[PDB]
Amino acid sequence: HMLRPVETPTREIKKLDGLWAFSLDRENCGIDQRWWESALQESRAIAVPGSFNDQFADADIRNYAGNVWYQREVFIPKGWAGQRIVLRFDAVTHYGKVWVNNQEVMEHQGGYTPFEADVTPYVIAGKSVRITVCVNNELNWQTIPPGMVITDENGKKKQSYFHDFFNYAGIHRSVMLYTTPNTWVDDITVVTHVAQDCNHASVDWQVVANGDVSVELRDADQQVVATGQSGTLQVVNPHLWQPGEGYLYELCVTAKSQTECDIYPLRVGIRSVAVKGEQFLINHKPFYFTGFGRHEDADLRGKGFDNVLMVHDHALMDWIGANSYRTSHYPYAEEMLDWADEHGIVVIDETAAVGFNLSLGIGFGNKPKELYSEEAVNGETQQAHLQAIKELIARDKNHPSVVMWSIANEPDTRPQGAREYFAPLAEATRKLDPTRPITCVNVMFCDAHTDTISDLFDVLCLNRYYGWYVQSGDLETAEKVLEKELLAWQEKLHQPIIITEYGVDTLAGLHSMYTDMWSEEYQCAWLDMYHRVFDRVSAVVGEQVWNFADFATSQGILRVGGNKKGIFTRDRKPKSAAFLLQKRWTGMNFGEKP
Amino acid sequence: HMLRPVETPTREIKKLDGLWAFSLDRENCGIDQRWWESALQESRAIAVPGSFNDQFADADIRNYAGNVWYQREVFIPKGWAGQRIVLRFDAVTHYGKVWVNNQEVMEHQGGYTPFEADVTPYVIAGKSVRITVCVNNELNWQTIPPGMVITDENGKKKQSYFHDFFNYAGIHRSVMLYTTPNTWVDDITVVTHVAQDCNHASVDWQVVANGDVSVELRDADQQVVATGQGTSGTLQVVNPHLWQPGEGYLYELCVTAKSQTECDIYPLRVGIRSVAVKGEQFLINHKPFYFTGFGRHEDADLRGKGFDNVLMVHDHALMDWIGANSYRTSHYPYAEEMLDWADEHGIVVIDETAAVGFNLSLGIGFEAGNKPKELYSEEAVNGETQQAHLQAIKELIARDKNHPSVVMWSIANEPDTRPQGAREYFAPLAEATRKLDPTRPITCVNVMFCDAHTDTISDLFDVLCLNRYYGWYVQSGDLETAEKVLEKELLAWQEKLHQPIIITEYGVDTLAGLHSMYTDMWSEEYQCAWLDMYHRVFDRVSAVVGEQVWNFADFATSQGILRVGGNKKGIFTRDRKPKSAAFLLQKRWTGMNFGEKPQQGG
């Protein structure tokens, strides 16, 4: 059960003061000596939220593998006596264990979604409370994403993994205490059915075993459009949420007990999404995706959320004419999807299940020789995977801006076990939520004649790098390979085709008369050639450029101080292909394919 | 009366949530049609804290001159019934006017120090209250810093100013509502006297509004070491753990404000430390100290001068790594988080007002008009510029009075002191500052072309602060001639004043990546040679007790043929990557013993 806390007759004290106390645990004796009982000795100030890696300009902290300890004091507001008090972490990347003054509150494996707990019997209103959080950043074969910790014969752990971005960790998002009465709306699901945009229904389902519920549908002018009294349904008149506007009704659910009362406001976007034939229909009209795969990657904070960075990246995506993006390779911060709700941005929401593939040269030992096996990606990783889809859906269900779930990124689907693995996951997800199409984004070398699993999904998502990783430098042959491959998919599946990734590394400042790789002239010619090919194949309904910005990776001979396929630098300065994308994307009609 | 909000039987609701509503006012009718009365129209989301300029990647918001509108709703807690509620803005840059549901509560001009208002009579506990703020970013001759707003024929205003950083504006630090009981400690002043490091007296004086006071002084182990009574006139005798550069041991002063019915307790951090200028030495706890480090800026990539916690932790990691022990709040007061950090980690800090650009002889700044023909006149820098300047000195001292890390007040930065009337202006504010805070030495930072033969006002101050660029702006490229000019100038300054000499700005513009076998201007090799030549001169002049490299990091300036996308004299880049010179400084500042002048050897 998860909703984003709001303020009303429910309160919140945001505890991301910044400046917790922080210390490594190189000897792995924190839990044994129970460091949560006292103040951490030999600690230093750390900023919350933000990754602990890049915060101290220290190579030993940055590449650290083990447990790290956060700690902070905080006075509980005296006006909270007799309320339910919830300690919420919006994200603790990979693993957290929480103590409130010698008492353990909660522990969570899965570093991108919230976890909260009821802390009433362990705090008294008005006195100071100590919170210790033991964060762990290790990946093994049953974490999402997977990884492999290797120890030397001397005892220092080095982490290996199989995805392209760097393995930042720490407290990445909001820690907050929020209160609620002891009669409290705990969960609301709303499904919205449309059919020629003139009168449509909002089925309701909501759970609070603590009180009886009234529901009342407000509009943007705070005037009531419908009312009902769990398992509700309301019928309404026309003004849909559309990728242009993003008109949001606001549905206040009241939970009445005789003694107490609780009001929770949930914003509803009224619209439909459905795949038919080769079309991706938003409110029964075909839609053409444009935009980026992104990353939560910033200069000094790592993957730490930041409001200024959010406003400025959306100013850039607005200027460049993108209507859509994909939360590439892990669930994003919540405010991202709240912003897309208000501004009508289409989002592909995606689980952290990346790196199920031992055949890439990206992302940092001796790896197992068959991927699907006990040794790696066994039954326990399948259920850990499924738990990640449950948590992601449970968090983002009501968001209108999420038009599609992506259960995994670039899995190796050639060995079997790939289908024996992904078939139950696609079916569990489809029943967890049937209001949105389902996809799995497919890696390049699993071409149309080789991949095993994409007929279990609704939309086909392709990451193609012809002219980069294969046919390197030759736009002409890469053109012909590209335009032979997507026609091959179209005949095979007759599904909508989104190219969720296409991009080439580009050094900001490298200019060439010869249009060769790494130069800005090549990123321009490359993107345009992919565009010529997209426009001639009817089945492609979306383009998303690989990354919007340069981002940090693990060290390697293939990554010049990071992944450089950005349209913008890590500084968010535009490479000269930003004006290529702005000109094409804003010249087209909104949401419609050239 | 100014105090840092703390949480001890007192509560705060940080309204920094960012994502306020934001709107410009190009027709300048927001005051006319009463924009605070309803929700801002055609607004957009803005992050707070943070300058508004670089946030939307649009030049016409960036160079906007006029009023900006922020707006936000906030639910006010039920359990603050019998409590006093205060709305506080730790910085609204330049001018800010606030409305609490159609009622103006506050108004402030001064972009870098906090202002607050008591909001109890217009707030209902439990109901949502809407907060509208009108911010202005204009500078005239009686603002600090000064400037000239230039109207074209169509009413579009362009701001010209005379300082070398961009004029970022908006709500730059943290906006909060906090409580207090209706009996409350409103101001504390603490002075600490040192007598050869064995026993000392902490003069206390407190202005509680509404109660008798006891004080209690606790150590780092929270054990009581001294008690006292009375609204003031508390002086406590210790056998102490001094606040030292390097460690920064902080006692704790618990001030009790007890009335008949209510109670209020405020914990103020107290560093036991004495600062004194004796001879050509700057003594901290009666020992000669050598400053190393930086002039800084509150400047980052997309938040402008917006405060940020990751950025503060990382920059202190770097300043600790490179061996710096000091810095100067270059050109405006910094956030209090910065000076609280310096208090904890024993970092020596020169505090500075915003009085920069009292000089119309520099190519620095924005030149979008015609500058006045005389700086010290009724048209520019008049008696009201002097009162605004005094006001800025009082607010600055009123906030940082008890920070042990502050060792000096900087009244102004590089004023032009050749014209008569520079002393008619600066003498009264120098004595008024000494009457505001007589426990810390006083300085004014001296511009390069006011040499020892020409400067008129430096004898009014305790420490001589120099900004020199020989071999850059003059004798360009010529290291061997520059060495002679610099050593001649520094020996002249010492002989004329016999004050301590801190070089608060020396640096050269340096493109990261530009390398040269000829050690040319703008190359990383030049930066290195230039810094090291300056260092050989310093080490030969006894009166020099400090070196502060001009900037820690590259920062944004206004457009001009002298500023390649900003000022590039940083040791680090804007995204905090080290230039070659960073390893030069690290070898010097970590090779010296801590806090002591290199004896011309190694």
Ligand SMILES: O=C(O)[C@H]1CNC[C@@H](O)[C@@H]1O
């Ligand atoms: O090679 C690339 O740049 C991309 C290929 N597909 C997956 C991405 O994580 C990766 O970054």
Ligand SMILES: O=C(O)[C@H]1CNC[C@@H](O)[C@@H]1O
């Ligand atoms: O020109 C420079 O680089 C510096 C000269 N002295 C004043 C500073 O504000 C300025 O940044």
